[PDB]
Design a protein around this nucleic acid. Structure first.
Ligand SMILES: [Mg+2]
Lengths: 208, 165, 147
RNA sequence: CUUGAGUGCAGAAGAGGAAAGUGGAAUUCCAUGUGUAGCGGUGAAAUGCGCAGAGAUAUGGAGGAACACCAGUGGCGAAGGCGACUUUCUGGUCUGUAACUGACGCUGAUGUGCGAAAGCGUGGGGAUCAAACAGGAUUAGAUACCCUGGUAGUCCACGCCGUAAACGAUGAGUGCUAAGUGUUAGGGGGUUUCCCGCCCCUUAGUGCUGCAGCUAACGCAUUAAGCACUCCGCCUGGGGAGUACGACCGCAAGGUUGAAACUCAAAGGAAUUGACGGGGACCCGCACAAGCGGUGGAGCAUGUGGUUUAAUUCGAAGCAACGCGAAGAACCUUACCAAAUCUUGACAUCCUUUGACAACUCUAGAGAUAGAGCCUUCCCCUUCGGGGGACAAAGUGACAGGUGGUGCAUGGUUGUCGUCAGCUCGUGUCGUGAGAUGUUGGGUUAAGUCCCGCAACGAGCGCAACCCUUAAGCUUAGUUGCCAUCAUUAAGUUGGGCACUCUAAGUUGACUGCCGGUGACAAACCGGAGGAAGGUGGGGAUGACGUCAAAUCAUCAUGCCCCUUAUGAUUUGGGCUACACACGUGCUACAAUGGACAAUACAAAGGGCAGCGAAACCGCGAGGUCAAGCAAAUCCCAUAAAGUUGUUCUCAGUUCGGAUUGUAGUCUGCAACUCGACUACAUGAAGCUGGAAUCGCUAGUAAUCGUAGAUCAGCAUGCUACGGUGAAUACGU
């Protein structure tokens, strides 16, 4: 309790993992191989604002793909960048890779992108409300059945913390065939720290 | 409603806000509010109100109900025809016309009213209660029970210019 | 809310045995009660030669209340008929519970003494009958004009 | 002059008043007859009355007070008030009438008088009822409620006080303005043979619902709180205070008149929402009952408190902290303490400066460490430099670090109210408004579940499902699984087989869904069949808006604040585990369903690669040698135990129990001294079912037996799952 994330509930049925490889019971070498991948990507995230990266892993190789709204940041002009990133990766990965960018579609309706965005306007001291109303508003143009959008902490860089939410549309949550994009974020200006809890719902579909 | 028309010019104008509560066990659910008047300052004005969990919602809803109720407000010479006293729920009121060049003299709310119905020079003192609402309802009660020379001499068998203010 | 019966037991052929063994089964050892009871119906016939159903059925009539009380409200308490289910349940319940209270060292001597004395209208089972039927159906006057 | 007012004339009614008179029941007191042992009272009792015969029962006597039915939102009167009846005297009112006088009227200061009950005087009376009082009881106490008695007084007459929620908290009088509907005394008319019956109308008071309108709202509405006029009285924030001084009246208590000082920023009305009620209606729940078993006693383990301490490391504290974080405390961990030790530091990034990196011994030291030998050695790319992952010791400013405080500044995370069934938003309506409306009512459900009805229509979150698991079957596939047909065998071990079991994949099925009744035909309830499984089939996961300024800065992250040659650092040893005591959690006991010995059958689930430890051998034993198979349906963990059959025991602090202590040994780890675990011998504790209070649980449940794992050099009575045996009761709210 109290509530949970849907993703650890919907997983097992309607989402594969962000990470995939052979068990053999030796995980720790390979899972904490993945762990540094999970670290370094922040230095793409800061410019890219990516949703999620997969790691498929065949026997002798690695195959990943980063979900972005901004390809041009990471692809380089004509490929100037991803090779550089392979170079800075092999130095610690200590094994080959075929990093293969992926674009995510209806590109900016996504969750971690948009949660990150509203955090970004809270970084430069945007007032809280317009962020949320414009979030839901543009979301509703782009097509969706319902959205929730939340913030916590000391609003307006002010006294004891609060939390609100401006949801619209139906947000089927305690059901089990949803395929919703939950995320989370953080941001500091001067006082403590500010997180969020975005949500969406965009139609019912399985991975088979 | 009655008969909002969105066609004239408009100038919304705000009089107050409260923070107003309904206590349910545990917390205290409260709902900001506001009153509004809307007129063309050319011969039309009326109030409008509403409540919401947030201001812009409240004021906008108020304005949507605002246009829906109106009075014609017989005006003459950039001035009201004569003097009355309005009365509604102990929010009495008293107006009087004026030598021009004065400007409306009155309190905050009523000033926002008559300044929005395009009246220029007039004298008043609010009376009874100081509460903003029934003050206004006093005003428009009087303006609703108000007449000009054409409004009257029509009725009486005779006609103006043997009689005029 | 109904009863969910126990079927027969064909040792020795009857059903009250079936309802009996289960109460003696302290801590879920059904074979021990099975043994000592069945032997009790060997020995009760051995001493005082007769049938097991004579001593058993007759006793569990002799120790079997048919009128009884219950409290409610000051302190008043309705005299109340006993359902046949609870009738036998009380007979056997207080039967074993006092059959304990004899105080012998033997598995079955205590029982044969119990129901063969009960079948002679003696033993604390019969005294329990007489006490319950004493306070009951002696103060009936006040609590009887009710359900 | 007659329309206001008053007088008439003919009428109607009435608990209108004062005095006298009469009568029945009933209470009581006494007397008598009858007759015995209780009466009377309470929630339970007691005190009292009673064998001197009560009470109860019958007769008759006295005596005071009140008057059953009738009695009604009915009447009367100026109010207070007035209810048995009859007489005497006597006040006003309403109608009709209209001759009669012709404005004589309304209000009313100061004055004058009547005025509930209590109270007072003087005198009579004294049946009940009953302040004060006594006794009893309850109660911590009860001079209070309760009970038994019980005086003044209630009562009458003459006098006196002279007030009240004296209320409709609404001054008197006149006049105008929608209806409906009853009621009381009358009047006119039509119908009726006769109205006495029916109807229509009109006056006077009387009650209710209601518009116009008023009012802040509730509400009033021809009996105005409406529309107005006259006259009178009265108010100017609350406490101080109806107090004080003074006057006046009074037999007296006290009544009338009636301030101030100081002091407060409120006092207060009406209505909405929420909570609450020892207020009410309904339903549900291991909430009660019906039942079983336990804690509390006895000893042990574990944790908190305390005590004590160089330190006994911090947090958590009613449920909603106390076998929690801590799913592993010799060191390590460990934060705390003593000692020796350090300064870009234990450690991370940056610049220089280099360099691939290092190891084994000696010394000193407890280690930390250094003191010397020794050798780490430009490896990927070089054309003499260089570039590089990566080393380097030194400088080294930025720095680094803080288990350093604030969880009442925060993110994140989690409990709890509670899987309780509810909580909210839009549009529109009402309301001056806060708010209400929906979401209410009838019916219905485990469910704001659903139908119907309704100034409400819709949406969302929520329950349900949606998913995992479970109950049966069909297809598919057959090794390591199985062996039915057979052969063979220690043995399914192998030939052969995949029929069955099984293994995991796909699909069928259960949905008021089929029938019958009931029911607003509907929802839904009840029963019937079928099927393995009927009304969410069992279970799990899932936890609304929010609450407790709940918990965590010590998982982490972090604002602010603070430390810095130490609030940072390394190491050895130590403690986190103390011990007059209490508390809570749990274990084993207090023995014959029992104890000891021997034989003997039935599982499920999960783990094993530097780990499972098969066989055999030694040893009483923990264990030891030894090594086969084993990355697993293969082989090992791993006998399952309870049970079942047998022998013995025959009620003892016992062959009960199994604490504590000494000795002898096993393994792990360097080393088991604080402080590991384990076996063997000997010891042989308290304790013979648990007080006051108290917890768990409704069927595979409780009760009860053992197994596997995580954490793990060694160490779990605890935690999690796993199955085995397996019940009693559920009258009912
Ligand atoms: Mg009348």
């Amino acid at each position: 309790g109290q509530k949970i994330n849907p993703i650890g509930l919907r997983v097992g049925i309607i989402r594969d993992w962000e990470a995939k490889w052979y068990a053999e019971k030796d995980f720790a070498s390979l899972l904490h191989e993945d762990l540094k991948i999970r670290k370094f990507i922040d230095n793409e995230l800061k410019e890219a604002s990516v949703s999620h990266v997969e790691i498929e892993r065949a026997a002798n190789r690695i195959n990943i793909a980063i979900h972005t709204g901004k390809p041009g940041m990471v692809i380089g002009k004509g490929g100037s960048e991803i090779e550089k990133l392979r170079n800075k990766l092999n130095a610690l990965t200590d094994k080959k890779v075929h990093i293969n960018v992926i674009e995510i579609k209806k590109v900016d309706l996504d969750a971690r992108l948009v949660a990150e965005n509203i955090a970004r306007q809270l970084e430069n001291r945007a007032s809280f409300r317009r962020v949320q109303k414009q979030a839901i508003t543009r979301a509703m143009k782009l097509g969706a059945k319902g959205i929730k959008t939340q913030v916590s902490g000391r609003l307006g860089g002010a006294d004891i913390a609060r939390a609100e939410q401006y949801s619209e549309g139906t947000v089927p949550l305690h059901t089990l065939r949803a395929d919703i994009d939950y995320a989370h974020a953080e941001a500091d200006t001067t006082y403590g720290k500010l997180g969020v809890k975005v949500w969406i719902y965009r139609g019912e579909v399985l991975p088979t | 409603a009655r008969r909002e028309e969105e066609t004239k010019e408009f100038e919304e104008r705000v009089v107050t806000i409260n923070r107003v509560a309904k206590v349910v066990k545990g917390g205290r659910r409260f709902r900001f509010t506001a009153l509004v008047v809307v007129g063309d300052k050319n011969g039309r004005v009326g109030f409008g109100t509403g409540k919401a969990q947030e201001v812009p919602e409240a004021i906008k809803k108020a304005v949507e109900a605002a246009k829906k109720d109106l009075v014609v407000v017989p005006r003459v010479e950039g001035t009201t025809p004569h003097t009355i006293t309005g009365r509604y729920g102990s929010g009495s009121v008293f107006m009087k016309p004026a030598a021009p060049g004065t400007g409306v003299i009155a309190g905050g709310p009523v000033r926002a009213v008559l300044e929005l119905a395009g009246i220029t020079d007039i004298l008043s003192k609010s009376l009874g209660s100081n509460t903003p609402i029934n003050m206004v309802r006093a005003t428009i009660d009087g303006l609703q029970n108000l007449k000009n020379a054409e409004d009257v001499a029509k009725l009486r068998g005779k006609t103006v210019e043997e009689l005029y203010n | 809310v109904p009863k969910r019966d126990v079927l027969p037991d064909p040792i020795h052929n009857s059903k009250l045995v079936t309802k009996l063994i289960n109460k003696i089964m302290l801590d879920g050892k059904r074979g021990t009660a099975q043994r000592i009871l069945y032997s009790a119906f060997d020995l009760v016939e051995q001493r005082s030669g007769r049938d097991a159903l004579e001593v058993f059925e007759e006793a569990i009539n002799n120790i079997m209340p048919v009128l009884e009380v219950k409290a409610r409200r000051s302190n008043y308490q309705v005299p109340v008929e006993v359902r046949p289910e609870r009738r036998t349940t009380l007979g056997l319940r207080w039967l074993v519970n006092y059959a304990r209270l004899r105080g012998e060292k033997t598995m079955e001597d205590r029982l044969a003494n119990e129901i063969l004395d009960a079948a002679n209208n003696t033993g604390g089972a019969v005294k329990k009958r007489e006490d319950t039927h004493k306070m009951a159906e002696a103060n009936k006057a006040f609590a009887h004009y009710r359900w």
